Design a protein around this ligand. Structure first.
Ligand code: MET
Ligand SMILES: [Zn+2]
Ligand SMILES: [Zn+2]
Length: 746
C-alpha cells in the first residue's frame, strides 16, 4: 500500500492563485472560484488514484490555510469579525485570512521550520466553539461521488491548541490546553459524520509531537485520545508526524494513544526515530514510512528507500508497512512535466509532487513483489549520472577544504578600533543616516545598460538632495530578486520555470535550485556599484545577500550537509566583497534577511546551526581591510534568544527591524552583552503606506538613545523601499533626516 500525507493546492499552473485573486478583486463570482476549486480537487484525487495510491488524502485542499480551516471547523472566529453562528462561508473565512476595509486580519506565522505560513488561532475562555464548517465531510463525499475513496485529514486537536495564541485581554495565567474540553466534542461530531459517510480511515496531523514537549503537555495528548477512543471506534486512525524525529518520551505517548492504529513518521528528516522503532513498536499497528521527501525537489533514491522499507517490514511488514511521503507535498513543487527549459539530465535528478506520488507507488509495488524493473533502472542511472557529473563536483572542494583552518574572524582588530579607521575614511556625523537598499521601482521595461544608469543617477541625485542622507545606496534597479540575482551568476545553480511553492494565502515563491558546487566565475556587483560610487562624493555602499539567506531560500542539494554547501556560497561571496573593496567601495552591506529561517526544530540542534550560519557570514569578509566598513541587515525585531550569534557575526554595523517595537527592548544589546559596534534599529515602517513625521521619528530616536550610545547609533528605515511609492518615501525620508539633524543639535 502507498500513502500521501498531503498535496499542493495551487494547481500545476497556479490556477487557484488567479482564481482567488480574481474573486478577491470582484472580477469573478463565488461560484466561479468554487468551480476552479472543485475541478482542482477532482484532478488531484483522480491523479493519485490512477497512480495506484491507496491512502489518498481529502481536506488537504485549502483556500488559504489548513490551520485557518480547522479554526472555521471549530467556529473559533475572533469577536471583531462579528460572526453570529451558522455554517461559515467565504466572507468570514477570507475576512480572517486577510481582513477587510474596517477590520485587521489574524496574524500569520511560520509553520514549523518550513517556508510556509499559517494563520494563528486567537483563543481564550470567552470563545464559544461550534461545528461551523463541514469542509472535511463535504470533501470526503465529493471525492466519493467522483469514485475515489479518500482519507480525511484533520489538524490534531492538541497540536491545534499548541499552535494557537491567547487573544488580547486573556490573562497570562490562562493555558490554551485548558480548552480541550471545548473543542474535542466538535472533533467527535466531525468524525461521526465521516464514519457515517463511509470513511474507514481518518488522518490526524499532530506535528507538534516532533517538538520538545514537557511531560505535562505530552499528557494532554494522552487524555485527548483517551477521550476520543470510543468515537474512533471502528475506524483505522493514522496520527501523522513530520519535519523532525520524535523525542523518546514523545514516542511512548504516541505509540500508546487510545484509538490510534497507525503511525506516520518522517524518515527523511526524522530518521533518528528509527532507533525507537527498532527498540519497540506496538503489537499490530501500521507504520507509515515517509521515505519520499516532500520537502525538497530531488528524485528519490529507490535503492536506499527499498533497503529501509524492507528492514521495517521485518519489524511488522505483515501488511502493516505503508509507503508514505516525509511530509505534505504542500512544501514542494507541483509537476516536473511543466519544466521545459532545464536539460534532460538535471531533470532526471529531480522530482516534483506529481513524480513523488509515482515514486511512493513504485516503492509500494516493489515491496509487494511487483517491482517495475524499468522504473528502478531509470532511477539507478539518474542517481549515477548525478553522482558522477562534473557539473555537480568541482575544484571548489580545494578551497572548501581550508576553511577548517579554525574560525574566520576579521583580522583581530576589535570592532571598536576598526570603527576608528573607518571613521577616518568616512567623516560621518553623529547619528548618520542611510537606507537599506532598494528604492521604489518606476516605469521600467522588459541598450539596457543606459536605461538602468538613468534610474540610479536619479536615486543618487535624490539621495543627495534628499536630506543628504550620510551614506547612499544605488536602489538596486537592476535586480529582480535578492537571491536569484546572484544565483544566476553562480556555479551550482539552476532555475526552474514553473516550480512554485505556496508561501501563504495566494503568494507563491519559485526557489532557485542549487544542484552542485558553487563558485563565482566573474564580478557580479562591482560594475553597478562602481558606477553608482562616482556620481557622488558621498559614501556608496555595496549590496550583497548573505550566504545563509541564499541557502535558506533555495531548494538545496541533498547529497551533502547544508553547512558544507553554505560555505561554498560564503566563499564565492567572499570574492565579490574583496572585489568591491579593490573597486573602491569602502562600505559593503551584506543582508541576511533569512538568518533565522534555518533554525532546527530540535532545540539542542540550534547552537550548531547558528555556528555555521554565522561562520559563513564571517567567511564572507574575514579578509577585508580595517578601514572598510561592513554592514549586515536582518529582517527581525526579536533577537533575545539569538543575540550572542549576532555578536559573533562581528559586523561593524548591523541594521535590524524596529519601529513597531518598544525601544526599551534594545537593552538586549547593552546588558550582559556590551555590543560596542554600530547598530541601526528601524524608525520607519516600510510595510505601511503612511508617512511618519519628523516629530515621531525624532521621538523614537531619543527614546532609543535612552538605551543605546550616541556614537554607534544609526538612523535608517525598517527595510528596503521596493514595495513603497516615491510619494510615500520622499516625505518620509525627509522627516527621518530632520529628526536626526535636530537631535544632533541638541
Ligand atoms: C529583504 S532584506 C533587504 C534587501 C535589499 N537590500 C533591499 O533593500 O530591499
Ligand atoms: Zn529587511
Ligand atoms: Zn560565541
Amino acid at each position: 500500500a502507498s500513502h500521501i500525507v498531503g498535496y499542493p493546492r495551487m494547481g500545476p499552473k497556479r490556477e487557484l492563485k488567479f482564481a482567488l485573486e480574481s474573486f478577491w478583486d470582484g472580477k469573478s463570482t463565488a461560484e466561479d472560484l468554487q468551480k476552479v476549486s472543485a475541478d482542482l480537487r477532482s484532478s488531484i484525487w483522480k491523479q493519485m488514484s490512477a497512480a495506484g495510491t491507496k491512502f489518498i488524502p481529502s481536506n488537504t485542499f485549502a483556500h488559504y490555510d489548513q490551520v485557518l480551516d480547522t479554526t472555521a471547523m471549530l467556529g473559533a472566529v475572533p469577536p471583531r469579525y462579528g460572526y453570529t453562528g451558522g455554517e461559515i462561508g467565504l466572507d468570514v473565512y477570507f475576512s480572517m485570512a486577510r481582513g477587510n476595509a474596517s477590520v485587521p486580519a489574524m496574524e500569520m506565522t511560520k509553520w514549523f521550520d518550513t517556508n510556509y505560513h499559517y494563520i494563528v488561532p486567537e483563543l481564550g475562555p470567552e470563545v464559544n466553539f461550534s461545528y461551523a464548517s463541514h469542509k472535511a465531510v463535504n470533501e470526503y463525499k465529493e471525492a466519493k461521488a467522483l469514485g475515489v475513496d479518500t482519507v480525511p485529514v484533520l489538524v490534531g486537536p492538541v497540536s491545534y491548541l499548541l499552535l494557537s495564541k491567547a487573544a488580547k485581554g486573556v490573562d497570562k495565567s490562562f493555558e490554551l490546553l485548558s480548552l480541550l474540553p471545548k473543542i474535542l466534542p466538535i472533533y467527535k461530531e466531525v468524525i461521526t459524520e465521516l464514519k457515517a459517510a463511509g470513511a474507514t480511515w481518518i488522518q490526524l496531523d499532530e506535528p507538534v509531537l516532533v517538538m520538545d514537549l514537557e511531560g505535562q503537555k505530552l499528557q494532554a495528548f494522552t487524555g485527548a485520545y483517551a477521550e476520543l477512543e470510543s468515537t474512533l471506534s471502528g475506524l483505522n486512525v493514522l496520527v501523522e508526524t513530520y519535519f523532525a524525529d520524535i523525542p523518546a518520551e514523545a514516542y511512548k505517548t504516541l505509540t500508546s494513544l487510545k484509538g490510534v492504529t497507525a503511525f506516520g513518521f518522517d524518515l527523511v528528516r526524522g530518521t533518528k526515530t528509527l532507533d525507537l522503532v527498532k527498540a519497540g513498536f506496538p503489537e499490530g499497528k501500521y507504520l507509515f514510512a515517509g521515505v519520499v521527501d516532500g520537502r525538497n525537489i530531488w528524485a528519490n533514491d529507490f535503492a536506499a528507500s527499498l533497503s529501509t522499507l524492507q528492514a521495517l517490514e521485518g519489524i511488522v511488514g505483515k501488511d502493516k508497512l505503508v509507503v508514505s511521503t516525509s511530509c505534505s507535498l504542500l512544501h514542494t513543487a507541483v509537476d516536473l512535466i511543466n519544466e521545459t527549459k532545464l536539460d534532460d539530465e538535471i531533470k532526471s535528478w529531480m522530482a516534483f509532487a506529481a513524480q513523488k506520488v509515482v515514486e511512493v507507488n513504485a516503492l509500494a509495488k516493489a515491496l509487494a513483489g511487483q517491482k517495475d524493473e524499468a522504473l528502478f533502472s531509470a532511477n539507478a542511472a539518474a542517481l549515477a549520472s548525478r553522482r558522477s557529473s562534473p557539473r555537480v563536483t568541482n575544484e571548489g572542494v580545494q578551497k572548501a577544504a581550508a576553511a577548517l583552518k579554525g574560525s574566520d574572524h576579521r583580522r583581530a582588530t576589535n570592532v571598536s578600533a576598526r570603527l576608528d579607521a573607518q571613521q577616518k575614511k568616512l567623516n560621518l556625523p553623529i547619528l548618520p543616516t542611510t537606507t537599506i537598499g532598494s528604492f521604489p521601482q518606476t516605469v521600467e521595461l522588459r541598450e539596457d545598460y543606459v536605461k538602468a544608469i538613468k534610474e540610479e543617477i536619479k536615486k543618487v541625485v535624490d539621495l543627495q538632495e534628499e536630506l543628504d542622507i550620510d551614506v547612499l545606496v544605488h536602489g538596486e534597479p537592476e535586480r529582480n530578486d535578492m537571491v536569484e540575482y546572484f544565483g544566476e551568476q553562480l556555479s551550482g545553480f539552476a532555475f526552474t520555470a514553473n516550480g512554485w511553492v505556496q508561501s501563504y494565502g495566494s503568494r507563491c515563491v519559485k526557489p532557485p535550485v542549487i544542484y552542485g558546487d558553487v563558485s563565482r566565475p566573474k564580478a557580479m556587483t562591482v560594475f553597478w556599484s562602481a558606477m553608482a560610487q562616482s556620481m557622488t562624493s558621498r559614501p556608496m555602499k555595496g549590496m550583497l545577500t548573505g550566504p545563509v539567506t541564499i541557502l535558506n531560500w533555495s531548494f538545496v542539494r541533498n547529497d551533502q550537509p547544508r553547512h558544507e554547501t553554505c560555505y561554498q556560497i560564503a566563499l564565492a561571496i567572499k570574492d565579490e566583497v574583496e572585489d568591491l573593496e579593490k573597486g573602491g567601495i569602502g562600505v559593503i552591506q551584506i543582508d541576511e534577511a533569512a538568518l533565522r529561517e534555518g533554525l532546527p526544530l530540535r532545540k539542542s540542534e540550534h547552537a550548531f546551526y547558528l555556528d555555521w550560519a554565522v561562520h559563513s557570514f564571517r567567511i564572507t569578509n574575514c579578509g577585508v581591510q580595517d578601514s572598510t566598513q561592513i554592514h549586515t541587515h536582518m529582517c527581525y525585531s526579536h533577537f533575545n534568544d539569538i543575540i550572542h550569534s549576532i555578536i559573533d557575526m562581528d559586523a561593524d554595523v548591523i541594521t535590524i527591524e524596529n519601529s513597531r517595537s518598544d525601544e526599551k527592548l534594545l537593552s538586549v544589546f547593552r546588558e550582559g552583552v556590551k555590543y560596542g559596534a554600530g547598530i541601526g534599529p528601524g524608525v520607519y515602517d516600510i510595510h505601511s503606506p503612511r508617512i511618519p513625521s519628523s516629530e515621531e521619528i525624532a521621538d523614537r530616536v531619543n527614546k532609543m538613545l535612552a538605551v543605546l550610545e550616541q556614537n554607534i547609533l544609526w538612523v535608517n528605515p525598517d527595510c528596503g523601499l521596493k514595495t513603497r511609492k516615491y510619494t510615500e518615501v520622499k516625505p518620509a525620508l525627509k522627516n527621518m533626516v530632520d529628526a536626526a539633524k535636530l537631535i544632533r543639535s541638541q
